[PDB]
């Protein structure tokens, strides 16, 4: 009986995870608006929240969530609109590159001294910033992330090296949130753009390469019920969105006997830890014993009638058992192969049918020799280059096939790929695909999302709209593009600052790589000797001028002379 939905809600999830989320939802649905007025918002939410419990029955306790939310966001455009269109209104303001200061964290003594101040409000401070610039973070993974950030500062601010405990730890969850923060956004994107059937087929592939021993009637409760927590999360209802993902930790750990002999471990976690346990956890050893597909998917003489009759089922169980025999397919991969084997049923099942669909799988021997083939001759590059000269190279290439695209877009999408190498090339080969094309589907869709707000590049929202499954292959295939008018130097190009000299090697390279994009679009067709030229010419003239006895001045002058011997180049 859920009289009053708000309350439900409070008590499903507890005060404490309750104020947390109604917090990530408030700095996602208004990005720009300050943290103090934000926490005044949430703290007269949880209050009125308190009455509801107390009686369900009273005054607006029945009101929807997005109401009540809407309501006091609009205490402080979308505040003109009605309760249907408002939230739709919210939600499609969402802002995947918020025009926000750069976060930088102070020194460890003035973090450590601001934890022991007030440690909840040290706590809401980093929900309020991270889920302003991730506006489609998976907010009850960011309740983990709080609790492993908490941790590391009541650990580490009572050692005696505060910094040297404190800020490997720190680093480690910034770059796992904003890994965690792209995945996540893959599957917004996915049911927003493309739909709930196209979400339903990836958790299908996904949870069957997982959960291999799992019956078909076990996996479609797990997508139906997966499907359901990241449409909440997806559409702004966190609150929601956390309650259903508990209830399906608790599914999943309670019929472990019947979905994986993996779970043992995550299943004995804490609430928060369980959950991300159970979405990482790794495959189940496949059954032995497994038939071939060929009896009831290519050569039964019922194919036809059982994809007129049952096309959702047939289709599901299709995948279903190709995904379980190959977890060492991408998922992005079994979901082309189910595409395949669809619309050739589609062409066979109108023409001598049983002859013509029996061929079905020598059409699938292209598409998985082409992301085998990337795979390899990407990774023995990566062998040869290392992770930074990898990601010079994907840069040049992927400046060259989309010139169009901003600048400090190309460079992070750049740097992102080249971390395919570090992340899956040392991987047996086994594991490698999924790793590889399904992280690239991730960094992808990152390229579309931060483009879409600002369309320059035909290609890439062709590549971005015509079909997410086939997106990686999309990218891969173009080649240089010849219609691209080449950038003449300007000044905001390139003269270069002595604060270049005292960078950490991480903004170094970044500067350096945002000047190797600058000269491609300055020369889309400049080979790579050429290219090297150049930019060796440029760190002979960092090296110089950061050296020289008068900074600042060689950077001026040798500066222009740098300009000129490259357009002269």
Same mark, same amino acid.
């Given at each position: 009986?859920? @009289?009053?939905? =708000? ?14 989320? /109604? ?21 007269? /939410? ?6 509801? +419990? ?18 006091? &966001? ?19 303001? !969402? ?9 930088? #964290? ?35 993974? &960011?309740?983990?992330?709080?609790? #492993? ?12 090296? @505060? ?6 730890? &720190? ?6 949130? @904003? ?39 076990? +996996? ?40 994986? $002999? ?6 004995? !976690?804490?609430?928060?830890?369980? $959950? ?53 397919? $991408? ?81 992070? /999408? ?41 369309? +320059? ?11 997410? =499954? ?9 080649? +240089? ?26 903004? #170094? ?41 008068? !900074? ?18």
């Amino acid at each position: 009986a859920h @009289k009053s939905e =708000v309350a439900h809600r409070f008590k499903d999830l507890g005060e404490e995870n309750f104020k947390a989320l /109604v917090l990530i939802a408030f700095a996602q649905y208004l990005q720009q608006c300050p943290f103090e007025d934000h926490v005044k918002l949430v703290n007269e /939410v949880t209050e009125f929240a308190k009455t509801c +419990v107390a009686d369900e029955s009273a005054e607006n306790c029945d009101k929807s969530l997005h109401t009540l939310f809407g309501d006091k &966001l609009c205490t402080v455009d979308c505040c003109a609109k009605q309760e249907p269109e408002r939230n739709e209104c919210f939600l499609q303001h !969402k802002d995947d590159n918020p025009n926000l200061p750069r976060l930088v #964290r102070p020194e460890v003594d003035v973090m450590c001294t601001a934890f022991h101040d007030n440690e909840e409000t040290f706590l809401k401070k980093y929900l309020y910033e991270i889920a302003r610039r991730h506006p489609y973070f998976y907010a009850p993974e &960011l309740l983990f992330f709080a609790k #492993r950030y908490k941790a590391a500062f009541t650990e580490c601010c009572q050692a005696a090296d @505060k910094a040297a405990c404190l800020l490997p730890k &720190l680093d480690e969850l910034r770059d796992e949130g @904003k890994a965690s923060s792209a995945k996540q956004r893959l599957k917004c994107a996915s049911l927003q753009k493309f739909g709930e059937r196209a979400f339903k087929a990836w958790a299908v592939a996904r949870l069957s390469q997982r959960f291999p021993k799992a019956e078909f009637a076990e +996996v479609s409760k797990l997508v139906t019920d997966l499907t359901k927590v990241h449409t909440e999360c997806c559409h702004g209802d966190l609150l929601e969105c956390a309650d259903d993902r508990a209830d399906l930790a608790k599914y999943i750990c309670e019929n472990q006997d019947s979905i994986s $002999s993996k779970l043992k471990e995550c299943c004995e !976690k804490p609430l928060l830890e369980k $959950s991300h346990c159970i979405a990482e956890v790794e495959n189940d050893e496949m059954p032995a014993d497994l038939p071939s597909l060929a009896a009831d998917f290519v050569e039964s003489k019922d194919v036809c009638k059982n994809y007129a009759e049952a096309k959702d089922v047939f289709l599901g169980m299709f995948l279903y058992e190709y995904a379980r025999r190959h977890p060492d397919y $991408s998922v992005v991969l079994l979901l082309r192969l189910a595409k395949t084997y669809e619309t050739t049923l589609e062409k066979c099942c109108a023409a001598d049918p049983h002859e013509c669909y029996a061929k079905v799988f020598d059409e699938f021997k292209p598409l998985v020799e082409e992301p085998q083939n990337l795979i390899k001759q990407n990774c023995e590059l990566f062998e040869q280059l290392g992770e930074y000269k990898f990601q010079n190279a994907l840069l040049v290439r992927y400046t060259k096939k989309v010139p169009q695209v901003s600048t400090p877009t190309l460079v992070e /999408v750049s740097r992102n790929l080249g971390k395919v190498g570090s992340k899956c090339c040392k991987h047996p080969e086994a594991k490698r695909m999924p790793c590889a094309e399904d992280y690239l589907s991730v960094v992808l869709n990152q390229l579309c999302v931060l483009h879409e707000k600002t369309p +320059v590049s035909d290609r890439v929202t062709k590549c971005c709209t015509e079909s997410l =499954v086939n997106r990686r292959p999309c990218f891969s295939a173009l080649e +240089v593009d010849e219609t691209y008018v080449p950038k003449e130097f300007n000044a905001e190009t390139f003269t270069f600052h002595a604060d270049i000299c005292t960078l950490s090697e991480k903004e #170094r390279q970044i500067k350096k790589q945002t000047a190797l994009v600058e000269l491609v679009k300055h020369k889309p067709k400049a080979t790579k000797e050429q290219l090297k030229a150049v930019m060796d010419d440029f760190a002979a003239f960092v090296e110089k001028c950061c050296k020289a006895d008068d !900074k600042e001045t060689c950077f001026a002058e040798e500066g222009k002379k740098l300009v000129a011997a490259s357009q002269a180049a």
